[PDB]
Amino acid sequence: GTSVKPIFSRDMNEAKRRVRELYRAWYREVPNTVHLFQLDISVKQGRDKVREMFMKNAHVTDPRVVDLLVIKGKMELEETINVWKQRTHIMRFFHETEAPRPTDFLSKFYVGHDP
Amino acid sequence: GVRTSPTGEKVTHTGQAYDDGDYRRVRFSDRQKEVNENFAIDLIAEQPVSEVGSRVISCDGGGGALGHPRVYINLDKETKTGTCGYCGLQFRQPHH
Amino acid sequence: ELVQVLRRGLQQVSGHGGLRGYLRVLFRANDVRVGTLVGEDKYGNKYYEDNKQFFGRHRWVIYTTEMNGRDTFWDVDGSMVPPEWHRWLHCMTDDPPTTKPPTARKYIWTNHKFNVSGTPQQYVPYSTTRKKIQEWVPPSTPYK
Amino acid sequence: LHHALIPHGKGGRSSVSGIVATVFGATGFLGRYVVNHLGRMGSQVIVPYRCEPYDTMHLRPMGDLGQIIFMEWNGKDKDSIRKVVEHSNVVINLVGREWETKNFDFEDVFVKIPHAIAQVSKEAGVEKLIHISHLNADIKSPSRYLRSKAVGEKEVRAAFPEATIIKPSDIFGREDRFLNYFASMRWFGGVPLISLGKETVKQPVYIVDVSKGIINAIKDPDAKGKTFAFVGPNRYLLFDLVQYIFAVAYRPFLPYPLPHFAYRWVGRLFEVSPFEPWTTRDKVERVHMSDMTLPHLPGLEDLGIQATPLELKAIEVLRRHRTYRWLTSEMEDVKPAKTVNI
Amino acid sequence: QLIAVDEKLDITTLTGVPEEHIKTRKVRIFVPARNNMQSGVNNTKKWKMEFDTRERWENPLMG
Amino acid sequence: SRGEYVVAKLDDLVNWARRSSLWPMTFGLACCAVEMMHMAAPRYDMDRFGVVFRASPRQSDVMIVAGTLTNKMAPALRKVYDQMPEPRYVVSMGSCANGGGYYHYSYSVVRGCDRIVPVDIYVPGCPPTAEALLYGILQLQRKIKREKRLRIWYRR
Amino acid sequence: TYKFVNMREPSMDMKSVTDRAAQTLLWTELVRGLGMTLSYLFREPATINYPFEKGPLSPRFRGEHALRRYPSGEERCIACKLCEAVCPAQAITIEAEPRADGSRRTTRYDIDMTKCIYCGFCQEACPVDAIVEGPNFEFSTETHEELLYNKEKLLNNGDKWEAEIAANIQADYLYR
Amino acid sequence: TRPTIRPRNDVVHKQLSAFGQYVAEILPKYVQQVQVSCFNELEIFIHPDGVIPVLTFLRDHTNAQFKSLADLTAVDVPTRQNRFEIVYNLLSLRFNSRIRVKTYTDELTPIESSVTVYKAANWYEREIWDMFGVFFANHPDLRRILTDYGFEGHPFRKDFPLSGYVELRYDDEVKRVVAEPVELAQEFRKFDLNSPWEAFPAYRQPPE
Numbered sequence A: 001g002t003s004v005k006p007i008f009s010r011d012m013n014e015a016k017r018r019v020r021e022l023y024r025a026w027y028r029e030v031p032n033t034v035h036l037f038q039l040d041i042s043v044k045q046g047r048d049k050v051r052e053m054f055m056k057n058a059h060v061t062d063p064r065v066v067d068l069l070v071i072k073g074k075m076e077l078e079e080t081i082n083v084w085k086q087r088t089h090i091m092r093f094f095h096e097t098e099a100p101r102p103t104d105f106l107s108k109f110y111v112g113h114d115p
Numbered sequence B: 001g002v003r004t005s006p007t008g009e010k011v012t013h014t015g016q017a018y019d020d021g022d023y024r025r026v027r028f029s030d031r032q033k034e035v036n037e038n039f040a041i042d043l044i045a046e047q048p049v050s051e052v053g054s055r056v057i058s059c060d061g062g063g064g065a066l067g068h069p070r071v072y073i074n075l076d077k078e079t080k081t082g083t084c085g086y087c088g089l090q091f092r093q094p095h096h
Numbered sequence C: 001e002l003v004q005v006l007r008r009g010l011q012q013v014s015g016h017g018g019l020r021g022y023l024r025v026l027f028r029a030n031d032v033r034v035g036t037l038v039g040e041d042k043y044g045n046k047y048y049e050d051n052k053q054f055f056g057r058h059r060w061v062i063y064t065t066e067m068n069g070r071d072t073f074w075d076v077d078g079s080m081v082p083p084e085w086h087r088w089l090h091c092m093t094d095d096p097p098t099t100k101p102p103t104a105r106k107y108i109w110t111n112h113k114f115n116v117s118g119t120p121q122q123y124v125p126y127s128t129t130r131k132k133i134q135e136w137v138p139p140s141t142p143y144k
Numbered sequence D: 001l002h003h004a005l006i007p008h009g010k011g012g013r014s015s016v017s018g019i020v021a022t023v024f025g026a027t028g029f030l031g032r033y034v035v036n037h038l039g040r041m042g043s044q045v046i047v048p049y050r051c052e053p054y055d056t057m058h059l060r061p062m063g064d065l066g067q068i069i070f071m072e073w074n075g076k077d078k079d080s081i082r083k084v085v086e087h088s089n090v091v092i093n094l095v096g097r098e099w100e101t102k103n104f105d106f107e108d109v110f111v112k113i114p115h116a117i118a119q120v121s122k123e124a125g126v127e128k129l130i131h132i133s134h135l136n137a138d139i140k141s142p143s144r145y146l147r148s149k150a151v152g153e154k155e156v157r158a159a160f161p162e163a164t165i166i167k168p169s170d171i172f173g174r175e176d177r178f179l180n181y182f183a184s185m186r187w188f189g190g191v192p193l194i195s196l197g198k199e200t201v202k203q204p205v206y207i208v209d210v211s212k213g214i215i216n217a218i219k220d221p222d223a224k225g226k227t228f229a230f231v232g233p234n235r236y237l238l239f240d241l242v243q244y245i246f247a248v249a250y251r252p253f254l255p256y257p258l259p260h261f262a263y264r265w266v267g268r269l270f271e272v273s274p275f276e277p278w279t280t281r282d283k284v285e286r287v288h289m290s291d292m293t294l295p296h297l298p299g300l301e302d303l304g305i306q307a308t309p310l311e312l313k314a315i316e317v318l319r320r321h322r323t324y325r326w327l328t329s330e331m332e333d334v335k336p337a338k339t340v341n342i
Numbered sequence E: 001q002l003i004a005v006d007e008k009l010d011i012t013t014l015t016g017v018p019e020e021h022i023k024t025r026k027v028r029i030f031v032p033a034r035n036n037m038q039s040g041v042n043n044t045k046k047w048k049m050e051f052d053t054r055e056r057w058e059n060p061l062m063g
Numbered sequence F: 001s002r003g004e005y006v007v008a009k010l011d012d013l014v015n016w017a018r019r020s021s022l023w024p025m026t027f028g029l030a031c032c033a034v035e036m037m038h039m040a041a042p043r044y045d046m047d048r049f050g051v052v053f054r055a056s057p058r059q060s061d062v063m064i065v066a067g068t069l070t071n072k073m074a075p076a077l078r079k080v081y082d083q084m085p086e087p088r089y090v091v092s093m094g095s096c097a098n099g100g101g102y103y104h105y106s107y108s109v110v111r112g113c114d115r116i117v118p119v120d121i122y123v124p125g126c127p128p129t130a131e132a133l134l135y136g137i138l139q140l141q142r143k144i145k146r147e148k149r150l151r152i153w154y155r156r
Numbered sequence G: 001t002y003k004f005v006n007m008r009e010p011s012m013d014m015k016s017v018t019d020r021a022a023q024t025l026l027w028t029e030l031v032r033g034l035g036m037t038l039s040y041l042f043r044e045p046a047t048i049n050y051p052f053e054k055g056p057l058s059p060r061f062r063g064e065h066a067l068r069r070y071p072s073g074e075e076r077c078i079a080c081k082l083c084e085a086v087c088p089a090q091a092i093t094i095e096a097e098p099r100a101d102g103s104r105r106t107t108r109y110d111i112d113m114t115k116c117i118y119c120g121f122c123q124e125a126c127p128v129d130a131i132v133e134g135p136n137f138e139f140s141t142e143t144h145e146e147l148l149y150n151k152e153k154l155l156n157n158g159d160k161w162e163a164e165i166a167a168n169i170q171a172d173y174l175y176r
Numbered sequence H: 001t002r003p004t005i006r007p008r009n010d011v012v013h014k015q016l017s018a019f020g021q022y023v024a025e026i027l028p029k030y031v032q033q034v035q036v037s038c039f040n041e042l043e044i045f046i047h048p049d050g051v052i053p054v055l056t057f058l059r060d061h062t063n064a065q066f067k068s069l070a071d072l073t074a075v076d077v078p079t080r081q082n083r084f085e086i087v088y089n090l091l092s093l094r095f096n097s098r099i100r101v102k103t104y105t106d107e108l109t110p111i112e113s114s115v116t117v118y119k120a121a122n123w124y125e126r127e128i129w130d131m132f133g134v135f136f137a138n139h140p141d142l143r144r145i146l147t148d149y150g151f152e153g154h155p156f157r158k159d160f161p162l163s164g165y166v167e168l169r170y171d172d173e174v175k176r177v178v179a180e181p182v183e184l185a186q187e188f189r190k191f192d193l194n195s196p197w198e199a200f201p202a203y204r205q206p207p208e
């Protein structure tokens, strides 16, 4: 039985429905975020970034973890809509000042000791 | 006891001077390199060895509570002088 | 009692070595008070005292016009005070270094230096320790 | 490799990159980006400056403690150059005016100074020298700018045979004199273009692309004695480029044709300013010269850089030139200009 | 009323840790050895978790 | 030369005007701002030197970073620094602003305000005394006295 | 035990009502405030003429750090690293080795003055009175790097301020 | 004993023990343990389901009248199956007494919000969520209170690094403040201070 108390959803289907609602809200919000923050990116870039952030956690199978992720996403959206975030916070999702770190074995061997 | 390296950089009391091919020298260009000129080893080397008439002597560095913790130094060996582990002063028993 | 304050102002004017001295102390320190001289530095600073002033104005220094290397007729700062007169001036003690000279030591600086930031004499930090890892030196001769 | 000059760390602010670079002309447009890219990865940067130290404050937060050093220098004095290049393994030359002053003409800043820097760096033991030239540099050019650039690169190659020469083409950025210059033309009502800009082709390049190309050329062992051309991905007719510039800034575009002699006279008239001229006859020539095509030279793609199109970075420069009513307009609103791609 | 989940516990997505410091780290679980310089054994009672040692380098300033 | 003398005298006049009227922004962050207030107090009376607090960044000449700069606060400090018209100066006061100080290893603290804005004068202490801050301000005045903008322009 | 602050009633007699009406129409308390400000106008101000006059300090005052010497010139520091351990901000970095004559001395002794909180814990922990906080507070710099003191800087500070430091310690060592 | 040793107060000890017995008798459904410390502080351990009934009883009962919520915080103990210890500190002005109510939760089990009992609990619960990640159900407005916007992780957890994962600086190319992975010029120096000899025999644990 595992006797666990839920947060919002009884199983994975209601968690998926909440995920879809949050995705809809973010998708609607993206153009307004682009206009209000005076971002140099396009709406397509913002929606692709939202999709990337959603797919980052695609492997989650625990409904409680999905509910907490949806709660955090709603907190982030509420921060973005109310302009509590600034342009720096929005652009932190893009990592525009970090150099692209290579993935292949030889490049890591050349640069240093990190695996 | 300051000394200059073959490059002209003053060698500090700790003996560190940049290698002629060391890029870190550039920090001293248009500026100076801070070096203390009072080398403590030479200063303590100038102090005379105190003659005392006992096998054990006490040293607190002078000034009472303004010195260092008081230690007792054995002086049985005539081959070498008794040095304070805190202050560096030297003591010995009368010989010759 | 108006004539009294006017005469005290005239006495302040006459007590600074004349009108030129009065304007010198007026434009160099924005203060024209006359006090009892306590002593003088080896660098030229003059120290005065007036116990009738309230705590904070009873001690003051008239800075020299030429310290170690620079002209200080206008460019003065609080770092030009030597340590003994620093102790007297900040009221850490009631005794000037004239009646109570400091303890002489062979390692104490004989010449005080002011804040040298922004000058070629500024302190530049550097590591004071030796190189830790020694590299192997290959032989200088051929191997066949 | 002089153990103190062995790379260490993760590649960030507190890391060691193994590069000790003296960056001449680091207080200008390209210089700040070059110093920023050097300082991101933990390089030691030497900034020789002739201006007032207040004009170098923006470069200070670009490096960790001790990683950026400022020393005065004089272009007409070789002792200053040797002083600032004694301990460096890389020397970058970004010195250049777009106008001639009473103390420094084009030959002084593009021929004499680069040659002196190259000779001093060679005799001082510097291993790598990066010299910046122009794509349109030509000994038979109607511009004294480009003739001086050609003579300067010839003499730099003569004095430092292992130097790397980079030839960018009309770099555009936030602090440029290319988009801002065209944007600035709205004040005079109409935009004077020679032949209506229909006989000029431009290939502008992004500032970050050029700075990253310089950084990668420093780290590339094959780029030692080569010559590179840094150009953008697209070629535009000058008329269409200026029209797109005005469209992005949401300003009314009123182009009219002006004869070459008259607009040269206008440039000469503007040249009399004791301050920075608004335009010069040399600028008159260079704006209306087509960008050369040099397919025999390696480009940004040979240094691992994909050229950034102007249509992606024009808004970050031209949004400042809009009025209040169009400030919030998005980037994908302004219908990118037609490109003459061969 | 409870939901009866049946999967092993995983909270990696909620800790805010970068991906590098989850999949490339190796933690050692052990009881620390007694410091041989002393005879006290009070420091060998609990279990410790520590990460794998990474690179340390000299700062160009101050060393 | 005549022009050299003229530009030197003009530099002297402009530098005197700028260092004799220094208006810091009404801007403080933590414990250090208390010592800033005490340096504004009647004992030291910065107003007698010509130093007046003004709330608007548009009307301020100096920013005194007096207190810890956190990550949440850094964008606001950068914003108010940027809005300052030039010439502008920044004075860093206290260990927290100089290098992070006693919260240097914290996850939410910027390790020195020089990562965000260029700094002209560093005032050490935790907190620096009001007298130490006055010394730092007078040092900033002396540094402003050494500017040679018009000489540099003339020699260009 | 307690008291009330705003529990007094005004008397309703014609005298008091007329006095309150005169207060309302003629602004008497405003004139009282003006009189207090005028009284302060003619008082002597509390301003001192810095830098010619200085604020009073104590022998216990904690200023710039310095490294002291024995009267023979020998360094007092013995590299015991108590100050490094106790330092609440981890501002002290110490390395040591036996000297050429076998003495226990430091080779690195750095104080990050931008990490320091000037608490004086280090001079309390020192068993030989080697590290102290001096009386100097006017050492502002123009660059961050100048506030990273190494052993040479601290030894120079000691050599430069020993005359005042010894006198300050002499006045307070019986309270320690 | 005398000059250097803290004196005892047996009267308060017995009073607090009696009131703890009283509370445990009135609420057997939720109370698991009652403790009185030797410096006279009363602690009541409850099941997580009893957060609202126990606090309501302590606030509204005539003999309790704990009308003031002094503090609400969390403690992270990674070795426990239930990671987070939730501590309530209450003050009674009618009886000049203080009480502590303690419960537990893990990373995924929500705790009931106490804003209906104490209005003060709003920001305390917000801070607990921000610092530890404990979700409070039915909280009127739950969001970060202390951390930066978009901050990832919960810093007060024992496994969160002291210096975090990202640091801030101003970047001139993008003309804004950016966040990058932390690099420290000097690494924080870990000190091993614990003595290998036992200090307090009164707290010695069985050797298992």
Ligand SMILES: CCCCCCCCCCCCCCCCC[C@@H](O)O[C@H](CO[C@H](O)CCCCCCCCCCCCCCC)COP(=O)(O)OCC[N+](C)(C)C
Pocket: C027, C028, C029, C030, C074, C075, C076, F009, F010, F012, F013, F016
């Ligand atoms: C007429 C309308 C148009 C012109 C508008 C301007 C009006 C004229 C400007 C008024 C000039 C007055 C300024 C002079 C005050 C200097 C005071 C003196 O102290 O300066 C010293 C030396 O002087 C300065 O070096 C230079 C000041 C003079 C500048 C040169 C004169 C230029 C005049 C040219 C007029 C042209 C105006 C523009 C015409 C279009 C430096 O000392 P300082 O460090 O401070 O004080 C130390 C503080 N202590 C004493 C407490 C320790």
Ligand SMILES: CCCCCCCC/C=C\CCCCCCCC(=O)O[C@H](COC(=O)CCCCCCC/C=C/CCCCCCCC)COP(=O)(O)OCCN
Pocket: G024, G025, G026, G027, G030
């Ligand atoms: C025989 C026939 C005679 C004919 C009639 C003549 C007799 C007249 C007698 C009455 C005259 C009274 C005149 C005063 C007018 C206004 C008084 C007043 O009541 O105003 C105050 C408010 O006025 C103020 O307090 C002023 C506020 C601003 C203060 C600014 C500084 C104060 C002034 C400094 C000194 C004034 C000097 C003025 C003259 C300068 C010389 C030109 C009321 O406000 P409250 O107390 O809140 O009551 C409201 C609800 N009941």
Ligand SMILES: NC(=O)C1=CN([C@@H]2O[C@H](COP(=O)(O)OP(=O)(O)OC[C@H]3O[C@@H](n4cnc5c(N)ncnc54)[C@H](OP(=O)(O)O)[C@@H]3O)[C@@H](O)[C@H]2O)C=CC1
Pocket: D024, D025, D026, D027, D028, D029, D030, D031, D050, D051, D075, D093, D094, D095, D096, D097, D098, D104, D109, D132, D133, D134, D135, D167, D168, D169, D170, D171, D172, D178
């Ligand atoms: N910008 C473009 O579109 C293109 C640029 N280039 C080349 O790139 C280089 C720099 O580009 P950019 O940064 O835009 O040019 P900037 O004018 O923006 O930078 C100029 C730099 O050169 C220095 N300098 C100029 N003349 C002298 C001198 N006589 N003595 C000493 N220093 C001097 C300036 O110092 P101070 O600030 O004191 O004047 C400044 O640091 C130039 O060589 C330019 O020709 C090549 C192709 C196109």
Ligand SMILES: CCCCCCCCCCC1=C(C)C(=O)C(OC)=C(OC)C1=O
Pocket: F026, F027, F028, F029, F030, F031, F032, F033, F034, F036, F037, F040, F053
């Ligand atoms: C006019 C009186 C002098 C005011 C000096 C300006 C103070 C600027 C610091 C801002 C600040 C204020 C106003 C302040 O009131 C305060 O206490 C809550 C602070 O905490 C330290 C502050 O940082």
Ligand code: SF4
Pocket: F030, F031, F032, F066, F067, F068, F093, F094, F095, F096, F097, F101, F102, F125, F126, F127, F128
């Ligand atoms: S430096 Fe010290 S006094 Fe100033 S804000 Fe930081 S902790 Fe407070």
Ligand code: SF4
Pocket: G083, G086, G087, G088, G089, G090, G091, G092, G111, G115, G116, G117, G118, G119, G120, G121, G122, G123
């Ligand atoms: S005063 Fe305190 S913070 Fe400063 S070095 Fe000494 S112990 Fe460390």
Ligand code: SF4
Pocket: G076, G077, G078, G079, G080, G081, G082, G083, G084, G094, G122, G125, G126, G127, G128, G129, G130, G131
């Ligand atoms: S300064 Fe004092 S406490 Fe610090 S290492 Fe030296 S002797 Fe020990």
Ligand SMILES: [Zn+2]
Pocket: B059, B060, B061, B068, B084, B085, B086, B087, B088, B089
């Ligand atoms: Zn001794």
